[PDB]
Amino acid sequence: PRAPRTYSKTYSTPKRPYESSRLDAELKLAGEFGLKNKKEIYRISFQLSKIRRAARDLLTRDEKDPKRLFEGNALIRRLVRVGVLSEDKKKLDYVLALKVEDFLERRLQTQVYKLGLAKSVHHARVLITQRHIAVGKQIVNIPSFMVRLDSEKHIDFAPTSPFGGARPGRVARRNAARKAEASGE
Amino acid sequence: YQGAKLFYLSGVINGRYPDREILNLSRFISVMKFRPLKWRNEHPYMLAD
Amino acid sequence: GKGKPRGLNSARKLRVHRRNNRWAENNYKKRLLGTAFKSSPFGGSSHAKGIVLEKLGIESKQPNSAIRKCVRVQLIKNGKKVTAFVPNDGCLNFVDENDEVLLAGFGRKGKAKGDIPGVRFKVVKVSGVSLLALWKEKKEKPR
Amino acid sequence: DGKRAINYQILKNKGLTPKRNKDNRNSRVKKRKKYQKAQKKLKSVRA
Amino acid sequence: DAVTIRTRKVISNPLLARKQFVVDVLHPNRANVSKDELREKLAEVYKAEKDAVSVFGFRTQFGGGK
Amino acid sequence: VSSALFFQYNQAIKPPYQVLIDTNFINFSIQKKVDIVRGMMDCLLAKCNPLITDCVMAELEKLGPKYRIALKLARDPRIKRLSCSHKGTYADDCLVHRVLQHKCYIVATNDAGLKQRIRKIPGIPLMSVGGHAYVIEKLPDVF
Amino acid sequence: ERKLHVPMVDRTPEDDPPPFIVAVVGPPGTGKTTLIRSLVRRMTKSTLN
Amino acid sequence: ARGPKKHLKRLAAPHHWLLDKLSGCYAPRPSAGPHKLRESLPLIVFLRNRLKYALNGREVKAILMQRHVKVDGKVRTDTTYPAGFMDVITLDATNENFRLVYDVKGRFAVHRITDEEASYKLGKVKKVQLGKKGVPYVVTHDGRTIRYPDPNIKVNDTVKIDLASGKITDFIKFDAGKLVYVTGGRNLGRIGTIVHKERHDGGFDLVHIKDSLDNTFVTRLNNVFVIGEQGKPYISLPKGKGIKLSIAEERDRRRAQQGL
RNA sequence: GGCCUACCAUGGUUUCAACGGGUAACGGGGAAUAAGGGUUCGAUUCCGGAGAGGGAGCCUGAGAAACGGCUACCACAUCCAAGGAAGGCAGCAGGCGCGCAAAUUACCCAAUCCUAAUUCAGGGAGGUAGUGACAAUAAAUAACGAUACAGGGCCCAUUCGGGUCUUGUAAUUGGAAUGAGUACAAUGUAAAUACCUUAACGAGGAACAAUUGGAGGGCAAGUCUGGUGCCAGCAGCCGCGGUAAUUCCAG
RNA sequence: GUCGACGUACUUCAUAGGAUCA
Ligand SMILES: [Mg+2]
Ligand SMILES: [Mg+2]
Ligand SMILES: [Mg+2]
Ligand SMILES: [Mg+2]
Ligand SMILES: [Mg+2]
Ligand SMILES: [Mg+2]
Ligand SMILES: [Mg+2]
Ligand SMILES: [Mg+2]
Ligand SMILES: [Mg+2]
Ligand SMILES: [Mg+2]
Ligand SMILES: [Mg+2]
Ligand SMILES: [Mg+2]
Ligand SMILES: [Mg+2]
Ligand SMILES: [Mg+2]
Ligand SMILES: [Mg+2]
Ligand SMILES: [Mg+2]
Ligand SMILES: [Mg+2]
Ligand SMILES: [Zn+2]
């Protein structure tokens, strides 16, 4: 007795484990954006499946149906805001485009690397998950934080990192005291 | 085996353990049924007081 | 028309006609009468216990041959005695005589160069511990 | 001490598991190396 | 270095004799900020006796500094 | 060995797609009552642009007047008509030459032989009506 | 089929079975005299040493 | 189940109290009072949840026992007292008077009223009868029983009651053109005028209301409350006036109210 | 009210399936698969019924055919000075049901609510922490360089460039980064614990030691089987020495 | 009783056709 706190799983297994075009595709994706396992890709393909089917099921309405106008403007507004869709391509038709790389480009990891403060993809994932970048002034350490369209100007080095100008951190102080203790005190 | 329960005994306040735990041991080793082994049910043995 | 009625007042005929000619479908009568498991070797169960009655091929010269790997095992529910495979031939040292092997179906998908028609079970746990945990030397057999 | 403390081996209890790389620990690292290796091949056959 | 204590969503509730609000603390270059320092500064801002100010809640924000 | 192809990904195929129809894609569409444009929308979940080649349209017009409803479906105004630089030959040969010369169409067809000959070419997905809908085989952007 | 077993014979008596032997084992300093002391103190209310 | 129940598990509460699940396991169950169970609001859902004066359901009791809150002039202390439609909750400190009226989403609004309006309420009669020793009475919707009414008052007339004396002051008949506030069913809170009325000897006489944008709808008479003539109402209506916007116009309104 | 009694009448249901059996049948909201039509599951967070070992009674009360109420009987079973007496976990914890197994006989009314004469007492209702990887969410287990054989880009191959788009094969090493953990402290909370925050420590085999499976390869002064020779096949943790020694498919 | 008639359960036998080449 309490009310149930609901939940549901965000990814789903595809049709078949092997189908060598699928393995080659997942290797291209998970090597290009610097991912970890297949669940990241399947989670994004689960999101994009849900988006594209609900948009399809809208297209089988007729224009000036209130349900289609309401939820179409809703879906288009959200996908514009995330950045996935463009600003000019704002008809409902264009979301039956939108391959997976569009989502995986708005990911915070790749968005660090593209802003050129990260020197690779994997180095970006490591700066993210070691408490170093800060989207608002909020230190984000999730690599899958789906950056919005107007957060993107505010990504920078976290004010309490050692790169965002606070304090040399752990091994730099240790070496500083070791050098300036062996020479002097 | 798995699920075999162990008991955790805190301090020795007075030369002896607590009462809640020791009372649990006493209850548990006084409900317990033993297994018919092989070597013990062919040979007489004797423990010498 | 076809054999069946079609008028809009004959649902009762169609519904009874499906309710009779449905007992002539082996999976239906199998799953309602509760016959569905004497196909399966064990009873209803998925594993089954057994006593190691003896070993087979303990005097077979040719090593790793299948008849070297098979023991002969009496089940404790029926009383019927069958034969059982064992993975990894070194694991014949673990089973002795009057152990309790817990058998599972062998269920092999395919048949190899020198295999055996007739072994249908395989040994999973020998006297409580599991043969992957003795062969990998995690646990050891509590006598 | 006088205490016969326990081994390492009979604490973590991993007998006879085979020896894998230092790259089955970290899936991201393994897919990274396998991508930048199977991209070399496509830089010879797409010549 | 300098906490700043701002007080948001102020309601004056005179039928339990109080002013209830949401304390919002900035403390940069400092960890979690002590509760007696809050009751001192709050009871000074509102000009009330220190033993008349109560305070609770206070989760400090992921990333740290508020 | 074009600049788009991965090992077998073939990442120059993308929404909106361009399918090539065979002559017995139309027959089994009319038979299983799926519809061309919305059927491809309902499987690929993206816009489609079905294309029909001059060799295939000649073959449809060669069938006769018993198959005139399929011809009615093929002259539909929103099925574009790709024209082909051919003598005018068998349809399946024209499809294979199109596929080799550009590698950016997916091929909707239903004969087994053309299925095999397409499957040799690496990176050409292959729609086909089965059961009740348009199942797609070798496309790595499904769900 | 968790119940079934190799059948074995018991040969413990039914009228007066002997006392069960409860070994208490462990390393040197681990406190295995306080255990026996406090178990007996709970089970007879009569402390030993 | 051998006797009256006494606990009400949250998730069986009335949906319009807006009680969040996962905050506890049970919900305030209203005592017996003037208004029904499913269509009341306890004082603890009003003081704690709505106005945010309390934080617990204990500080509510320490408000109610200081003799602060009064429902309809008379000071009430049972913390789950069933306040209801058309009551006048006076809080002396804060100088406030509220009236509980609906709003077009179905909820109960926080609707402050002035002082001179806070000294009457409306009551739809529910029966008239000869009482005892030949004395007529009316029985309004909040359980009241008023002797000696004006003989032109029949069932469904809205009476206007003076809180202090308790006497009937005024009344309003039930006929077409009368302004109607709907308290019940799917259109809960919409305000229109009456247009027609269907007879149905045997059950459930329907009523065709039309709001002030010409959208007719039909409800049972049971769910209809009369609150004044055309134009002029007698209570003060909440903001938004009972219009029942539609969700595309609601979002155009919200978005065009972009002021900061 | 055939609910029962007295008298009277002979009716009532039924191939549109009554009656009688079977149900590993509490009903519903609901869960799953699904192109659909359907098919299956629903003791199990909400509502409705029924029960408190089995059958039958009943008291007090507005409300009970009540079982943390009573009375007798069937079944179990506890104490005894042998005369008597007291019982009901399908509440919470915890046990037996087998010889083969799996949460704590924990803290509290602080929150949600309930009861009472009542703001205050009480509540194993309900919260809190603990405990087998139930079902779910996020995601660590290293990042960037420079060194040690080859070439691949290829400006160039008229012949030496090792020059370099650097892709690495890498096995040494260069400093930078951080939390798992430990911890002053504050916060959290009824009180703690943990999270969130943070002084001081905390990374080279980063020994601060990822796993589960299946496919191949070789292993001879070895064994065993068969044969139209030196072979083949099975297999190979078993050889000539040697085990504080062999430092081996670095492993 | 290595008994019969059933009822369940399982096993097994029947797979090559054309074209070219030698
Ligand atoms: Mg001792
Ligand atoms: Mg109950
Ligand atoms: Mg009536
Ligand atoms: Mg009679
Ligand atoms: Mg059922
Ligand atoms: Mg049942
Ligand atoms: Mg149920
Ligand atoms: Mg009952
Ligand atoms: Mg029982
Ligand atoms: Mg009473
Ligand atoms: Mg009873
Ligand atoms: Mg009980
Ligand atoms: Mg009870
Ligand atoms: Mg229990
Ligand atoms: Mg209390
Ligand atoms: Mg009194
Ligand atoms: Mg409970
Ligand atoms: Zn052509």
> F83-92 — which CB contacts under 8 Å span 24+ positions?
F83/F53, F83/F54, F84/F53, F84/F54, F84/F55, F86/F54, F86/F55, F88/F54, F88/F55, F88/F58, F89/F55, F90/F55, F90/F59, F91/F22, F91/F23, F91/F53, F91/F55, F91/F56, F91/F59, F92/F22, F92/F117
Residues H16 and H98 in one domain: yes
User: Is A154 in contact with A147 (CB distance < 8 Å)?
Assistant: no
Note whether residue A3 is domain-resident.
no
Report whether A99 contacts F14 (CB < 8 A). Answer: yes
Q: What are phi and psi of G4, to 5 degrees?
A: -85, 155
How many alpha carbons lie under 13 Å from residue A51 in its C-beta half-sphere? 25
**How many residues appear in chain B?**
49
Query: Which of C42, C46, C76 should be substituted to probe chain G, the one whose Cβ sees the most G Cβ atoms within 10 Å?
Result: C76
| Nearest Cα to Cα of residue H200 among H226, H178, H220, H177 | H220
Number of other CB atoms surrounding residue F95 within 10 Å: 25
Chain E residue numbers with beta carbons less than 8 Å from the beta carbon of A160 are 63-65
Q: Where are the alpha helices (DSSP H) in chain C?
A: 11-20, 26-33, 131-135
User: Does any domain span residue A8?
Assistant: no
Task: Provide the residue type at F143 as one letter.
Answer: F
Closest CB to A27 among D27, D28, D38: D38
Is residue E30 within 8 Å of E60, Cβ to Cβ?
no
Phi, psi of A29 (to 5 degrees): -65, -55
CB atoms within 10 A of CB H139: 17
Residues after which chain B has a gap (C–N > 2.5 Å): none
DSSP H27: B
State the smallest CA–CA distance between residue B42 and chain G in angstroms. 9
Q: How far is CA H225 from CA A132, G16, H138, in A?
A: 63, 88, 16
Tell me how far apart the alpha carbons of residues A140 and C12 are, in angstroms, rounded to a whole number.
66
Q: B16–G41: do the CB atoms touch at under 8 Å? A: yes
- Which nucleotides of chain I does any protein CB come within 7 A of? 16, 24, 35, 45-47, 49-50, 62-66, 94-105, 110-115, 119-120, 125-127, 132, 135-145, 152-154, 167-169, 175-179, 184-189, 195-198, 202-203, 206, 209-213, 224-225, 233-238, 251
- Whether residue H251 lies inside any domain: the answer is no
User: Strand J contacts (CB < 7 A) among C residues 39-98?
Assistant: 39
Closest C-alpha to H156, from H126, H201, H120, H191? H126
Q: Does chain A touch chain E (at least 3 C-beta pairs within 8 Å)?
A: yes
Q: How far is CA H59 from the centre of its chain?
A: 26
Q: D17–C136: do the CB atoms touch at under 8 Å?
A: yes
Range(s) of the domain holding residue A114:
17-185
Concatenating the DSSP letter of every residue in E7-63 gives EEEEEEETTTTEEEEEEEEE-TTS-S--HHHHHHHHHHHTT--GGG------PPPTT
* CB pairs A-D closer than 8 Å: 25
CATH number at residue H65: 3.10.290.10
Number of domains in chain A: 1
How far is the C-alpha of F30 from the C-alpha of F36, rounded, in Å?
9
Q: How many domains are there within chain C?
A: 1
Same domain flag for H178 and H223: yes
Note which residues in 15-34 of chain B have CB less than 8 A from chain G: 15-17, 19, 22-23, 25-26, 29, 34
Q: Do the domain assignments include residue A10?
A: no
| DSSP reduced 3-state for C6 | coil
Under an 8 A CB cutoff, do H53 and E15 touch? yes
The verdict on H238 and H164 lying in the same domain is: no
Between the two ends of chain G, the Cα-to-Cα distance in Å is: 49
Determined by cryo-EM
| CB of H226 closer than 8 Å to CB of H176 | no
Q: To one decimal place, what's the resolution in Å?
A: 3.5
Token pair of H254 as six digits: 């919200």
CB contact under 8 A, H10 and A66: no
The single-letter code of the amino acid at H211 is: D
Contact H21 A69 (CB under 8 A): no
- Asked if residue A90 is part of any domain, the answer here is yes
Q: Which residues contact G36 (CB under 8 A, 6 or more apart)?
A: G24
Report yes or no on A5 lying in a domain.
Answer: no
Tell me the C-alpha to C-alpha distance, in Å, between residue H6 and each of A163, H27, H31, H174.
62, 11, 9, 39
**Which nucleotide is nearest to C30 if distance is taken from CA to C1'?**
J8
Question: Closest by alpha carbon to C124, among C137, C140, C96, C105?
Answer: C105
Residues found in chain E: 66
- Coil, helix or strand at residue H123: strand
Chain D nearest C-alpha distance from C127 (Å)? 20
CA gap H209, H243 in Å, rounded: 12
Contact list, A21 vs chain F (CB under 8 Å): 8-10, 123, 125, 138-140
Among candidate residues H99, H116, H133, the one where a domain is terminated? H116
Q: What burial letters (b/e) apply to G11-37, b meaning 16+ CB within 10 Å?
A: eeeeeeeeeeeeeeeeeeeeeeebbeb
G27 assigned ligand-binding residue: yes
For tokens 């239903």, the residue is F110
Question: H1: CA distance to ligand 2 center in Å?
Answer: 6
Residues C28 and H213: their CA atoms lie apart, in Å, by 62
Chosen for mutation from A156, A160, A167 (greatest number of chain E CBs closer than 10 Å) is A160
Residues pairing with E19 in the sheet: E12
The conformational region for residue B16 under phi > 0 = left, psi -120 to 50 = alpha, else beta, is: beta
CA-nearest of B29, B9, B8 to B17 is B9
Question: Left (φ > 0), alpha (ψ -120 to 50) or beta: where does A119 sit?
Answer: left
Query: Which residues numbered 10-49 in chain C sit less than 7 A from strand J, measured from CB?
Result: 26, 30, 35, 38-39
| Structural domain contains residue H252 | no
Amino acid at H252: D
In 3D space, the residue among A165, A119, A111 whose CA is nearest the CA of residue A140 turns out to be: A111
Q: Domain for residue H258, yes or no?
A: no
Contact between C49 and C103 (Cβ < 8 Å): yes
Chain A closest CA to H252's CA: distance in Å?
Answer: 11
Q: How far out from the chain centre does Cα H212 lie?
A: 21
Whether residue A9 lies inside any domain: the answer is: no
* Max Cα-Cα span within chain E: 40
CA C72, CA C84: separation in Å to the nearest integer?
Answer: 6
Query: Which of B17, B23, B41 minimises the CB distance to G11?
Result: B41
Contact call for F139 and A21, based on CB within 8 A? yes
Domain boundaries, position H159: 121-171
Residues H58 and H148 in one domain: no
H19 and H111 both lie in a single domain: yes
Residue in chain F closest to A100 (alpha carbons) equals F141
Residue F27 structure tokens: 């027959």
One domain for residues H23 and H96: yes
Q: Does H25 touch chain A (CB under 8 A)?
A: yes
* Shared-domain flag, residues H149 and H216: no
Strand J: which positions are within 7 A of a protein CB? 8-10
Give a yes or no: residue H131 inside a domain: yes
Interface of D with F (CB under 8 A): 38, 42, 45-46
**Distance (Å, rounded) from C-alpha F51 to C-alpha F71?**
14
Q: Evaluate whether F74 touches F37 at the Cβ level (below 8 Å).
A: no
> Which nucleotide is nearest, taking the CA of residue B32 and each C1'?
I96
Nucleotide closest in space to C41 (CA vs C1')? J9
Q: Any idea what DSSP says for residue H29?
A: P
Does the residue H259 lie in any domain? no
Residue H241, by phi and psi: left (phi above 0), alpha (psi -120 to 50) or beta?
left
In chain G, what residues touch D4 (CB-CB under 8 Å)?
Answer: 27
CA G6, distance to chain mean position in Å, is 25
- For residue G27, the chain D residues in CB contact (below 8 A) are 3-4
H94 touching chain E per CB within 8 A: yes
Residue H71 lies in a domain: yes
What range defines the domain where residue C139 resides? Answer: 1-143
DSSP one-letter code for D41: G
List the beta bridge partners of residue F130: F133
- The alpha carbon of G1 is separated from its chain's Cα centroid by a whole number of angstroms, namely 30
Pair of tokens at residue H53: 């004066």
Which residues 34-93 of chain H have a CB under 7 Å from nucleic chain I? 44, 48, 56-58, 61-62, 65-66, 79-80
Contact H143, H83 (CB under 8 A): no
In this structure, the answer to whether residues H55 and H36 fall within a common structural domain is yes
Contact F43, F134 (CB under 8 A): yes
C35: nt with nearest C1' to CA = J8
Nearest nucleotide, CA C39 to C1': J9
Number of domains in chain H: 3
The SS3 of residue H43 is helix
β-pair type (H41-42, H82-83): antiparallel
Question: Do H140 and H74 share a structural domain?
Answer: no
User: F95 and F52 in contact (C-beta within 8 Å)?
Assistant: no
> Is H30 within a domain?
yes
Task: Identify whether H254 is part of a domain.
Answer: no
CATH number of domain containing H205: 2.30.30.30
Q: Are residues H159 and H199 in the same domain?
A: no
- CA geometry: angle at F26 spanning F24 and F27, to 5°? 65
